[PDB]
Structures are given as C-alpha cells and as structure tokens.
Design brief:
The structure is a homodimer. Chain A is α/β, with parallel strands linked by helices. Chain A folds into two domains: 217 residues, Rossmann fold; 148 residues, Rossmann fold (3-Layer(aba) Sandwich). Helix content of chain A is 45%, strand content 16%. Chain A is built from 15 helices and twelve strands. In chain A, α4 packs antiparallel against α11. The two termini of chain A are 31 Å apart. Chains A and B meet through α4, α5, α11 and β9 of A and α4, α5, α11 and β9 of B. The complex binds 2-deoxy-2-amino glucitol-6-phosphate (2 copies). The site of one 2-deoxy-2-amino glucitol-6-phosphate (AGP) has 15 residues of chain B, from α4. Chains A, B: Pathway: Nucleotide-sugar biosynthesis; UDP-N-acetyl-alpha-D-glucosamine biosynthesis; alpha-D-glucosamine 6-phosphate from D-fructose 6-phosphate: step 1/1. Chains A, B: Homotetramer, may also exist as homodimers. Chains A, B: Keywords: Aminotransferase, Biological rhythms, Congenital myasthenic syndrome, Disease variant, Glutamine amidotransferase, Phosphoprotein, Repeat, Transferase. Chains A, B: GO terms for molecular function: carbohydrate derivative binding; glutamine-fructose-6-phosphate transaminase (isomerizing) activity.
Chain lengths: 365, 365
C-alpha cells in the first residue's frame, strides 16, 4: 500500500529525503568524515590496483553512470568508460584482467546487464554489483557489491533508485581517494553536501504545485528538447527518458555543446525547450547555449539554482532549485523532471506506475 | 557550380561512387591486397605501441567514429573510446602519454575538436588528424594525418565526407593488422568489399525515385524514430541528425537494444518508425526488435539487404540495399537516409544546402 499517495511513483519521489539517508546509513560518518562500504571492504585495495573502470548498464541505471563519470575520473584518476549493455555485447568489447567492471541494476535481473557480467567474468575482470535487490542474479554473481538500500521501487519509471545509485557511486569515489592529502578538502566539501542533501530535497519537493502548473502548460505538446552539459548531461537524458516512459511525448535529451552541430535547426517559437544551467565550471558555456536558443526564437523553461541571480534576473521562466556541490547538484536538478513526467502523465490520463509496452525488469530478450 | 544538379547536397550524394574511389586512390592496391596511408607511414609503428585509441569529434564526424569503433576494436585489439569533443573538455578527461588520439573533422576548424587536440598535445599524447581540408588548423597541428580526399563539400548536411571518413578509418584499421597471419583472410574479405563498393553505391543511387515516394509519405509527420544496433547504430544516429538538420522534423536515433528499456512506450500506429536490419551477427536480435515494434501496432519502414529473403517476405515496406561486408554495410545503408533527408527538405520548401540556424563549420563558441 501507498497510503497517503494515489501512486507508487509519487510516493517514491517524495521518499527521496529518506531513501538518500537510508543509502548512507551505517556508511558515512559525518563526525569524522569517514565512508566505509562494508560490501567493498575486502576488495577495495585490489580495485585500486586496476587500470580502468568500466560501468555497464541499461536505461536509467546507465544514466546513473553518466551522472557520476566525471567525479569518478576526478577522484580515482582512472579512465572511466560507460557502456550500454546491449551494445557492449554486440561489439565484443575488449576487456582485460586488470579491468574493474561495475554492473548497475535496480532489479538485478536485466538480461543484457547480466550477460555483460558473465562476459567480463569469463575474461577474468574484477566485477562489482550496484543494485537495489538483495539476492538478485547480478548481486549474487558479482565478486563484491553495494546494496543501495532505497527500498522497494514499484513505479516502472525509476526515481529513488536513480538518486540512490548516484549517491552510492559518489560514496565509492570517496573511499577511492581517502589516502590522498591533496583531496581531503574536496572530500569534506562533498561529504558536507551529502549531509545537507535530505533537507535540500525536501525543499525541492515543496515546489510540486509549481511543477504541476508547468505540466499544465506542456501536456498538449508532442515534443520537448531537454538540454544540458557536463554534470547535467545525465540529468537531461534521464528526464527525457522519464517523460518518454509514462507520458509518451517525444522528449529527447540534447548535449548542450552539440546544439550548434545540428539540433539548433529544430528550435523555433513552437518547439518546447527545457535548459539546465548550474553554477559549476560549465556556467558561461551554458549561458551561451541559452542565448543561442533565445536568439532563434525559442522560449525555454530554465532549471537553474536559487542563488543564480544573473539568470533569474534575465529569464522569465525559471525552476529554481537549491544550490549544492557541483558533483551532487544533479540529484536535486533531476527531481523537478521526475515530478514533471508524473504530472504530465496524470493530465493525459495515463497509468503513472504501469505504462504501456513496458515492464519493471527486462529479464528475457 | 553544381551544373546537372539543383543542389550541392544532391550532387555530393551522387558523387559517392567517385569520392570513395578518390579516398582509396594511391592507397589501396587490389592486385596484392596492400594498403598504405603515406601520411601515417612514419608514425604507424609508434601507433602500434600505444595502449588505447581515443576518437574525438563533433556531430557527423563523431558518428564516423561510432561507425568504425567495432572494426577498430576487432583489428587493433586496442580499447577504443569515442568522445563528443564538448563533453571531453567539460570533464577534464584523463589522457596519458601512451594514448593515440584521433581528431575527425571535415572542416579542420571546429572549435571544440581543435581545443580537444591542444588539450591532448599538452599531455603528450600522439595526435592524428582525419580531415577533408588541407591546410586546416587540425590538419596542421596534429603529429600526422590523413586527408580523406573527398573534394569540396558545400552542403551543410555532410554526405560524402562521412562516407570518406568511414573508409579512411577502415583503411587505418587494415594497416594496423597487416602483420597478423590469422587476420589475412579478414583483411582480404574487407578489401574485396571496398573494391566492389563504388558499383554497389551506384546501385543504391538508382533507388532515388523510390525514396522520393517514401518522403512523399512522411513529410507531414512531426517525428520519426530510427532504430538500429551494432554496426548500424551509427547509421540511425547519422540519419536522425541529417533529417533534423535540413528538414526540422523531430527525428531521433534509438539504440535498438534499448527499445524495451523505455522508448518502446512511444510506439503506436501513429509514430513513424524506420528500422535497420542487416545480415550480420546482430540479425536475430534485430528481428526481435522488429517483432516488438509490430506487436505494439507500429508500421515500420525497414532498411534491409536485397538478399534478406525472410524479412522481404514477411514485411511490406522495405528499402532493399545491396549486400556488402558487415563492417562496410553502413556506407550503403546510410545513403537512402541521406536521400530521404534531401527529398523531405525539398517537399517542405526548405533550403537543402544552407539550413536555418547553422553553418558549415562551428569555429567560435
Ligand atoms: N524502467 C526504466 C527506467 O525508468 C528502464 O530504463 C530501466 O532503467 C532498465 O530496464 C534497466 O533496469 P535495471 O535498472 O533493473 O537494470
Ligand atoms: N554539419 C553537421 C553535419 O551534417 C555537423 O554535425 C558537423 O558534423 C559538425 O559541425 C562538425 O564539423 P566538422 O566535421 O567540420 O568538424
């Protein structure tokens, strides 16, 4: 039972202050800035010997990799490859004995991610499971793993499991660099953001009524282009998938740096556009993308941060989310897009929890 | 002057039997199965010492990397990473002294690809230029390079330059494995396909009138989903971009293995779909994607090969292209999509050569 909510998905979205706390429970100690993933305690030293991280997954679990890639590169200093499992297998991707391969899966039974796992094992790679289902195939067949501990997720369109996968990979990253003197201030910045994150998610959830009103403006449209870069590239892909999944509107994520390489031809006053701009090191380049969409008569809705005075000042339609650290900001930025997919589906008369043509786990072929 | 054609783009498309011959001229000897890229003659041995290939580009030049990745993995046995240049830079991607980095660019002046190049040089990586413009910045600042020799390309939506980039990267691959006894039959298979390719492209071009008729069926639509996998993933992305660029229809490339992970919710009898199915090792899995689109009331147009009796037999709308080798087939499969973008733009009244909001080369920011 979902008692208090009319759907599992809305309950799962509004559960994210608690699911994030649950993911970090018994793991992150805020008194002494320590993180310990017991499921990885044995194997961590072996992992630090490896020469490359490969993150292998499908759909939203794939996006959680795209969302943490840069901070994994930053803090591990290893090359990080993120791969859609179906294509990884079609190409007979080269994998080596000193590769560590991560398998990201809410269900733990996704057929292509699991066959990806067995392919890598057969080549002698170290395998790590990041899942939300204890006792699943992927959880059982990996060498080590982390249970994200988000609790059961019933809505086919994933919400809390994405944000808990994201926190889980950030925690792995923090363990990886815990012996580096030069990285200790960075780690402490990150851990203080994680401490603050539950309260900041409660604050994003208070904008539900405002997002319902924007859904009211959009539910007759047939397309929407969601543009972001850097840390927010994953957020645009993930919001795009969520809207496709339960609303059946043609939403597409566009890498903002690619705009002038073709997609900008789609922009005029009739194409709905959502732009994400955060105050990280991509800010000036995102301000360029925005200016270029407006120059071509686009009328974008802009997801920015609450303290971004210059874009709030100069832009009429803003969804203003709280400010966090650059590599956690996408946990906050994705939530209005989760809520927008939900409200659009309600307005169109569609089943938010069990959309047409889809299942929670794709276990066959 | 384009004399004989009403546009540069259609002339460039119909030039592809000759541009392919021009790309291979003085390079591939069919009498003794030798390939020699003189621009790489000095540096080839150093390249074979390197531990990873990174392919860095924007838009269609990016797609040429996606299109040759698998055969580069196959024949070099190296890891191959393909990167959108804007994102490569946003993430401060780790690059090493024993990386070989390829910069793919028709113009040779694309700002993000060029800044990508300088970033890699500064870290001591070996840099290789694949371009269509002699004397360009990228051509001049790399350590070595190949001029694809396609001739001037005026149409903003790239055609011959894509297929010549593709052949150029296949030729590099063949040079890389020319000392391996076990790979000699494979190389000879590939070189015999390249020998046959110009005549097979003439045969695809003879279906112009048939593609004009399909454009006639589609030019009132607002969306189209183009689905493929494996070797044809690049083809679906590239056709999708070409239709966006000059027709302004919302065309999106979908990885066919990802269908059941969300995008299948978009499929019903009103969503136009183009599916690509080739007789390579992904055939049975592509037949599964097709069956799943039809099960959900989709009415796909299917690009298949002429000798694919089972899908011709069981499917009403086929664009039947000649059969080639698996890793060259996308040179043939992309051409109907080039011609479809062209005819759609004509029917809608748009400038095929100089679309709105775009330029041939993005040299600034
Ligand atoms: N249900 C979709 C997400 O909202 C889908 O893309 C999903 O992520 C995919 O099927 C993989 O499932 P997994 O996370 O259980 O492996
Ligand atoms: N004109 C477009 C291709 O049709 C665009 O995506 C293009 O590939 C991109 O701007 C990169 O240009 P380049 O190949 O000159 O580097």
């Amino acid at each position: 039972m979902k008692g208090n909510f009319s759907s599992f998905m809305q309950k799962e979205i509004f559960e994210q202050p608690e699911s994030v706390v649950n993911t970090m429970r018994g793991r992150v100690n805020f008194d002494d800035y320590t993180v310990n993933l017991g499921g990885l305690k044995d194997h961590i030293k072996e992992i630090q010997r490896c020469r490359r991280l490969i993150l292998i997954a499908c759909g939203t679990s794939y996006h959680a990799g795209v969302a943490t890639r840069q901070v994994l590169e930053e803090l591990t200093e290893l090359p990080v490859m993120v791969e859609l499992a179906s294509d990884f297998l079609d190409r007979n991707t080269p994998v080596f004995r000193d590769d560590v391969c991560f398998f990201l899966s809410q269900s733990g039974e996704t057929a292509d991610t699991l066959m990806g796992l067995r392919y890598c094992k057969e080549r002698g790679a170290l395998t790590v499971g990041i899942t939300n289902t204890v006792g699943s195939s992927i959880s059982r067949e990996t060498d080590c793993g982390v249970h994200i501990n988000a609790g059961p997720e019933i809505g086919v369109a994933s919400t809390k499991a994405y944000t808990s996968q994201f926190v889980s990979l950030v925690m792995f990253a923090l363990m990886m660099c815990d012996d580096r003197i030069s990285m200790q201030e960075r780690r402490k910045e990150i851990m203080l953001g994680l401490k603050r994150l539950p309260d900041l998610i409660k604050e994003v959830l208070s904008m539900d009524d405002e997002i319902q009103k924007l859904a009211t403006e959009l539910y007759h449209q047939k397309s929407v282009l969601i543009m972001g870069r850097g840390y927010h590239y994953a957020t645009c892909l993930e919001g795009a998938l969520k809207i496709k999944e339960i609303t059946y509107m043609h939403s597409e994520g566009i890498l903002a740096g690619e705009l002038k390489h073709g997609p900008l031809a789609l922009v005029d006053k009739l194409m709905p556009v959502i732009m994400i701009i955060m105050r990280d090191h991509t800010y000036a380049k995102c301000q360029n993308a925005l200016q270029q969409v407006v120059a071509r008569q686009g009328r974008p809705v802009v997801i920015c941060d609450k303290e971004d005075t210059e874009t709030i000042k100069n832009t009429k339609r803003t969804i203003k989310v709280p400010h966090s650290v650059d590599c956690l900001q996408g946990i906050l930025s994705v939530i209005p897009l989760q809520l927008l997919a939900f409200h659009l589906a309600v307005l169109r008369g569609y089943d938010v929890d069990f959309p047409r043509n889809l299942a929670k786990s794709v276990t066959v072929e």
